[PDB]
Amino acid sequence: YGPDAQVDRSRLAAVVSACKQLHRAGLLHNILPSQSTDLHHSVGTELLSLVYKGIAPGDERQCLPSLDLSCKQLASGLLELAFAFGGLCERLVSLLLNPAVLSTSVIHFSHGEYFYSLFSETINTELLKNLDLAVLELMQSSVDNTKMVSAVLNGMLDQSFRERANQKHQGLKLATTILQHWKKCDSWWAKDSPLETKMAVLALLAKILQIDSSVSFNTSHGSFPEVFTTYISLLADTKLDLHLKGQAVTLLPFFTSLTGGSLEELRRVLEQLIVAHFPMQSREFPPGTPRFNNYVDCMKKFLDALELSQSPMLLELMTEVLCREQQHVMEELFQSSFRRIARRGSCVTQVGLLESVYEMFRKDDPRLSFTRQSFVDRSLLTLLWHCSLDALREFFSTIVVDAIDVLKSRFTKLNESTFDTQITKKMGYYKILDVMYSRLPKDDVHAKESKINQVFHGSCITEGNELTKTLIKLCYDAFTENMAGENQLLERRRLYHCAAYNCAISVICCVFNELKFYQGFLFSEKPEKNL
């Protein structure tokens, strides 16, 4: 029938509702005949075959008929009625993978795919009660198509996400039965698999992490060697586009909590991704170019993943991709993310982040002096400007020892022209001292405190006139250093002088209130010869 025979379909819907009421009352097997081996099975399979072959198996010549709202719910009720008789989920899932070709405006594809897309809210609704015997078979005996099994799994995951109302245990059961079967689907991710199954497994990886709570999967609890290697192979896919790698790296905060060499492998694959995708100047992609849109989207997704994770894992790569360019267009969002990750987590989190960036910028890696400058002044300065309390003191006690050990007199190698690295580290230490003194109160840094004793040897009974005195001497000899003879790195040494003068201003305005020290330090210029 078409759009004119409404009485027949109305009576059919009425009798189907009556049958459903009999079933939920416990009289469906007593009214419809069920006194044979497969009698109720016979009527159920008859209804299922009818609803399956009513759409268009027999009109492969002209066209498929349109399904209106009257039939859209009629067939959806007939499906539940047929499924109420018995557990024919295996027969249904067998009818799902039907490699036919619809002849139709011309969209040729599997008939089972159309049957699913018409009523995708029924199969997943009924499969949650009979989980294992269906999902095991549809995982094992359907790897040839690699498309329908992904779609039914996505539908079941969506249903479970909607079924979180007081029944989240079914979602945990789904998570368990898929983590114990990831080994059975090692053919989806290969070097020759089409992009369709790649997108499918990526959506699967995305949805399982929110359908599988951390209780069952934190660290090597839910068979990590399978899922982690799958995701690594997904990231290493070069033929894959970047817009989907956006979500692939958006689901990063789940794998940040690792401790072994797996985090090192993730670091390696992220570096190999950013070296193959990101440009050097980020200016070859003007606004409006789709490459520019993909670039800014993946950058903001990396920033949001770093913000949600607050991990010391990828902030090094973020700072590196930030500072390998003189001025980046995403600088404002970078600084916002830095301030947010500094203010979000507990003291230990920002302490670890500061220690990581300090190790990054302090080591002797053969990098440009401008790169190390950009590193410190862009990341660590802002982090210390927006870090929480009860952390600056610990970072001080950790770093300032070696900082002042290097600052004292290590000014050598005036021939190889590599002095720029030394003076860059010096000015970085001066800026660190400036930003740490700009926030510490009066008695926190100049009265009897623990970190003052940490700077000295054991407990120092003095008020603390050792670290302040050494810092004053160092900064004074720094910005008063005459340049009559040295004419090799005038600009870098001028920046060093400016940083030292700023640090002096900070450390003097922090605790000193007498105007005598103001003159005697910041203005007592003594032009003996060239001072």
Partner: protein
Amino acid sequence: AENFRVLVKQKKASFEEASNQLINHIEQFLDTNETPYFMKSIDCIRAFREEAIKFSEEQRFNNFLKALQEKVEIKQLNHFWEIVDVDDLLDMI
């Protein structure tokens, strides 16, 4: 290299223009101490060498082949050749 090698085909008949960006494409690659950059700098250098076998670049190729290695003489880069409290303070014032 692989990204900026399409312009030299027919669009920009002057290889002098596209050579500058191809040369700059490895400058910042040499600075970063990370290994993938070192592993892909030689890959771009191979594509830069590939043009002289079919375009006859040798009239200007050796002029930069030696300059790229002489730029190493200024740096170290020995691994890149592997491929080839008032009174006391008053006193000191």
